[PDB]
Ligand binder design. Structure first.
Ligand code: JZL
Ligand code: JZL
Lengths: 445, 446
């Protein structure tokens, strides 16, 4: 095992990693901004280092300060969590050249999957089904771009090669909008990602968001740990996640999973990763790969029994995968509700002091949050303050437990999306299952 | 399938909240019956209906048979869940409930009566094939020559036990003939005063036993299953502190052997609902001591390793539904540890009442928190010291223990004294980390 690690993150994920470290007897170094002295994980860590003032650019995104804290404490590894520097290939490369273990994939793999054009090319080569599109970058020749748009099937989407998630996209209904659209995206991409490379892709009308969890040791072994349905979204931001995805057969799971596992070997993947797809008419279409742990990883842990953070730590330590594909079994169902310090109606973030707090309990109830009574949610960071995960023997039990747990959850002093989550659990279409990616916006409209 | 419309939760604290959650999941309307001191209980605050049944002393509230039955009638409830303790093993209450036309969420009154009489309960178990402690196999008379002959056949040390006794009450260890007559006479007088039943029996006293118990479920359709075992040996002066499932050192073959015998005994006695067969385990052999005719405090450790919601099964059985799982569907997976959290003084072990000023619950993968407490809540001095239960699960015993250590360190209960520090000490104990420690261990450590 790794003797001592730096947790290069904050909030709920930092607390998640800290628990995993403590379970394995790994010493923890909590690096934090001056605004995050009162974070729960900071108070629980063996050593703490203040890495700079409140803005992320000065603290959590500050590479030299993070490296220096790792050198000063005698740490051997760095876990970047999710967000911040987790998908920054230059950070991964610097961590390794400085002699530390980077708890993530190789910097080259981050670059390969990070550039969306080459990622799709790599997946097509690996045998992973992708969304029909340009299959390369787009030029200045409108005649070639229009011929490509008719080849795929209108409507189409203009995507930034350096973009990802919910940023760097523009939908095209017809050829009249096409020219203005290919130009606006290039200007936005060059300003936001410092790369003007764009590509064209088929805009799928009625798709579901289905993603595959993988674990690869970087020694030739790679396993798939079922799927997650993350279709309940608003402004390209996940709200509810669940595992397994409803309507996915053991045969469909096996088909897509084996392809994802094979793709890991072919790209030399190391650690935990997720292959995101759009699922429509019984077919999967690759969109992107998250080369880190995901926010929604707990729903996969509940249904497989696999602790995903401990496995990241074992792989980083140089241990080959002990878990064999034949040992991965889907059992029961899990639902995750993201808890955000925001007004759901207006999207207005709600930082501030939590005057009253009470977490739900019970069988199959998992609460993932650093929040406590008297704690101030700082205005400098993202709105996500916690995650409520409920497990049951079937989908209906997990939903029933989630309704009860949401009713027990008290967060006063700030605005939350708790009431929105209660509305989603009570939604008859959600209760039936299989709602598409556009459902939540339509329901709220 | 048909389900109970509304039930009265005839209990308080953590178990009342546990029962409330199971009801809500099943769409059953809840009736929280409470004493005047228990208006601010979490489950009372979450219940669909509330009925104040009397003042703080349990005799006028939680043990008050007419007021509890009256609250079921007033609210139009169809069933009564007694939880554990209070009226849960009271056969007169269960008889009065049935008589009043309400469902008693438990076994038949006559089954409670049968298992509540320790002499009759042993005779029924021995007849069914359940292994028993060698003993008198009937009541002791006043003839001391006969009592010395029974003691010689059993072999000293022996234990004199009250037929109306149970748990940690109504027993006396005898090491030789010199103490026999007086020990029998003293047990009789104590039994007459406490139980209005002076019947005593003799049992072989075991030197280093483990307290291992088998969980059962039996429906009204003739199905009876076993849900592995629990080791409750980590205890002090008849008070459980740590429980775990499955029991260390128990092989699948040993589990199958004892479990099948317990399942067969349910069928023979016409058992209904949740129940536990309590055993003393020593030298790879099981010895029946008593049967709990209700749910136990430590039921969550069995739920974690089997996936079975024991409270929801009680509610399903009571509604007239078959068991939701078959024996072949019951699988032991992983390991679970329960730390009882008490508002108690660590030097005296007596209840420590008062107001909770700051409260923080632990979280994480495999962490389960069973408690009604919240910040600002006042622990009343009228009832037991138990304020909560911390349950950690893992794919093996070591992971469960590692998760417990971290969970206990995150647990904050300020304003009152707790056994949190003692629980941290037990988790750090190398003999506990090895496992298989006997019932006498904790007292010897302290
Ligand atoms: N081909 C498509 O129809 C399509 C549609 C969407 N909405 C895509 C979508 C495809 N791909 C992406 N995202 C990746 C991306 C964005 C910008 C530039 C490149 C990439 Cl790879 N997104 C955005 C997503 C936000 C939430 C909805 C479901 C999944 C996505 O995370
Ligand atoms: N035969 C024996 O060795 C024996 C010993 C004890 N200590 C017995 C014990 C046997 N049996 C009982 N209890 C049941 C009982 C008591 C009085 C009268 C009838 C009964 Cl069934 N107890 C009380 C125990 C409390 C301490 C820890 C856990 C094991 C036991 O609960």
């Amino acid at each position: 095992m790794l003797d001592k690690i730096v947790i290069a993150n904050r909030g709920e994920i930092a607390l998640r990693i800290l628990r995993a470290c403590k379970e394995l007897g790994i010493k923890t170094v909590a690096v934090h901004s001056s605004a995050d002295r009162d974070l729960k994980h900071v108070l629980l860590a063996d050593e703490t280092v203040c890495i700079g003032p409140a803005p992320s650019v000065k603290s959590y995104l500050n590479i030299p300060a993070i490296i220096s804290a790792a050198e000063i404490t005698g740490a051997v590894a760095i876990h970047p969590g999710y967000g911040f520097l987790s998908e920054n290939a230059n950070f991964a490369e610097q961590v390794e050249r400085s002699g530390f273990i980077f708890i993530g994939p190789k910097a080259e793999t981050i670059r390969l999957m990070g550039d969306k054009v080459s990622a799709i090319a790599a997946m097509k080569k690996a045998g992973v089904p992708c969304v029909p599109g340009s299959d390369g970058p787009l030029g200045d020749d409108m005649d070639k771009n229009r011929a490509i748009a008719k080849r795929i099937g209108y409507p189409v989407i203009i995507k930034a090669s350096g973009g990802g998630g919910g940023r760097g996209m523009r939908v095209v209904r017809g050829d009249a909008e096409l020219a203005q659209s290919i130009s606006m995206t290039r200007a936005e991409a060059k300003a936001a990602f410092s790369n003007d490379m764009v590509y064209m892709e088929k805009y799928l009308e009625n798709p579901r968001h289905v993603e595959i969890q993988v674990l690869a040791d970087g020694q030739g072994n790679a396993i798939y740990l079922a799927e997650r349905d993350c279709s309940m979204q608003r402004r390209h931001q996940k709200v509810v996640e669940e595992a397994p995805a409803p309507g996915i057969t053991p045969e469909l799971r096996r088909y897509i999973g084996e392809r994802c596992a094979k793709a890991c070997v072919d790209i030399g993947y190391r650690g935990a990763g997720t292959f995101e797809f759009l699922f429509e008419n019984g077919e999967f279409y690759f969109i992107e790969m998250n080369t880190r742990i995901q926010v929604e990883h707990p729903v996969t842990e509940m249904i497989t029994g696999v602790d995903l953070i401990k496995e990241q730590l074992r792989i980083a330590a140089g241990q080959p995968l002990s878990i064999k594909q034949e040992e991965v079994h889907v059992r029961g169902h899990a639902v995750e509700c993201r808890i955000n310090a925001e007004d759901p109606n207006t999207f207005l973030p709600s930082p501030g002091k939590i005057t009253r707090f009470h977490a739900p309990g019970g069988f199959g109830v998992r609460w993932e949050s650093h929040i406590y009574a008297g704690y101030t949610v700082p205005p400098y960071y993202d709105s996500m303050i916690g995650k409520l995960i409920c497990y049951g023997e079937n989908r209906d039990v997990a939903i029933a437990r989630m309704k009860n747990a949401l009713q027990e959850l008290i967060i006063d002093g700030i605005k939350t999306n708790v009431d929105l989550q209660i509305r989603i659990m009570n939604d008859e279409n959600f209760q039936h299952g299989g709602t598409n990616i556009h459902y939540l916006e339509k329901k709220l409209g």
